[PDB]
Symmetry: C2
Subunit: 265 residues, 2 copies
């Protein structure tokens, strides 16, 4: 009778909320997609074992083109769950799927889970200070995306931090590293030359948030661009005006160069 | 020798993650604070019952002034948990607590949980479009704060949405309703005449995020200012120019007026 949007979490199958696990356990059919993000600490098998149901994994095309043909029909007679990495509506286009559910006479419910959007708090950067967010997309053929560069500029101008989601091509098993995002940004800097992202820019890297030992590093591009941050997923953050305690955290927890402790108010 | 920062979730006791619950159950001591926020859909008793551990509540002063003499000493020869509503480290001052842990020779680990920062995605507003966030505080004595008004202005000017936390007196359990927030903003608008918040401004109200039956309402200030959104806490959102898909979600899911499909897009 109902359809559930249930977040799975950041890292592994234990990042699902208790509410989500118990509701998922009682659903008749369980669907899921693993293309909007990467849960580096689990497998479909572990998820299925935790929920006690077999999970039918859908592709991007299944969802975007056939959600109402594959999932919605079963919801009219059964309770259906649709699992996704992180929080189901964050940094995805899944919100629109609720409009489809409604237009098909299906009631939907959303069970949240830890999202990378708030997990950025572990970097020590005050979350209220983040401005507009962006995605560093892979160039394809002659098309070279650059809008994310302007986002940084705009936020930096306002003294705000910038959260940069990194691209993912799940079908190819390609997960953009913070390294690759930095390479791409320098290339954009060379083109526009707005003094927005250079070798001297301070950046923060958060890798595998949700794991017990995520990689949290901060430093100048020239120094981190070739550093190994471990397995994906990675997210990149370009901080704006640092508060004293923000810089202190980065130095003490993220191993940032002691120098950044000296802010230029 | 270990301190765990564990998120409690959004609404009730089942909003904690499976990882957070299992880890907490294994801790020798469990602390919590409910000053940054409260879990309006549950009680300390039910949380305590779910964890199976006595939960020691800490006040704002216990944490901010005495964290190192109340919590850290025990973390030296035991596993200790520190529960907070939402996602750990989102509250501005919490990240600093990890620095105190390090200074005490104590290892700390973060276990995430849903935060309103990501949960607001249920409003249909694209997450990348949120700008700087702010808190609406009461005017008191000769003090009349208005910075949150300028935040809205700077965000909306760049087509960005503004997430607005409402004032709360946790200890006294006194919330600021979305209604009062609107009145304050209208009063601030009358003082600054910047044309930021008026009877014609479109707003979104989110209450009881995390529950299976949250209240999601969108409309113009003149129609919602005296509407009943239910029990606190309330979260106010002043969106920027809406995406056609964002406007459609508000209409189909949040009961927004058809008028926004042409006026705010
Ligand atoms: N655990 C994690 N650690 C680091 N980055 C992550 C992450 N999870 C997601 N990301 C970032 O976010 C991108 C996916 S966008 C989808 C985000 C998801 N809906 C959520 O709520 O978290 C990843 O490619 C990466 O750039
Ligand atoms: Pt969309």
């Amino acid at each position: 009778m109902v359809l559930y949007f249930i977040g799975l979490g950041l890292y592994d199958e234990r990042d699902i909320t208790v509410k989500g696990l118990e509701i998922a356990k009682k659903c008749d059919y369980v669907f899921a997609e693993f293309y909007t993000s990467l849960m580096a600490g689990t497998t479909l098998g572990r998820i299925q074992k935790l929920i006690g149901k077999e999970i039918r994994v859908l592709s991007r095309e299944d969802v975007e083109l056939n959600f109402e043909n594959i999932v919605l029909p079963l919801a009219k007679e059964n309770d259906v769950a649709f699992l996704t990495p992180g929080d189901p509506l964050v940094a995805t286009t899944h919100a629109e799927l609720r409009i489809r559910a409604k237009r098909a006479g299906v009631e939907s419910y959303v069970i949240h889970a830890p999202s990378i959007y708030s997990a950025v708090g572990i970097t020590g950067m005050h979350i209220y200070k983040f401005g507009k967010s962006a995605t560093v997309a892979y160039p394809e053929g002659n098309w070279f995306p650059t809008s994310y560069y302007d986002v940084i500029k705009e936020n930096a101008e306002r003294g705000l931090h910038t959260l940069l989601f990194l691209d993912i091509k799940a079908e190819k098993r390609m997960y953009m590293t913070a390294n690759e995002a930095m390479e791409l940004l320098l290339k954009v800097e060379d083109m526009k030359k707005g003094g927005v992202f250079t070798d001297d820019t301070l950046v923060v890297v958060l890798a595998r948030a949700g794991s017990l030992n995520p990689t949290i590093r901060a430093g100048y591009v020239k120094d981190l661009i070739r550093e190994d941050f471990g397995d994906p997923p990675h997210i990149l953050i370009v901080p704006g005006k640092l508060h004293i305690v923000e810089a202190e955290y980065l130095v003490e927890i993220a191993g940032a160069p002691r120098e950044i402790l000296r802010v230029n108010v």
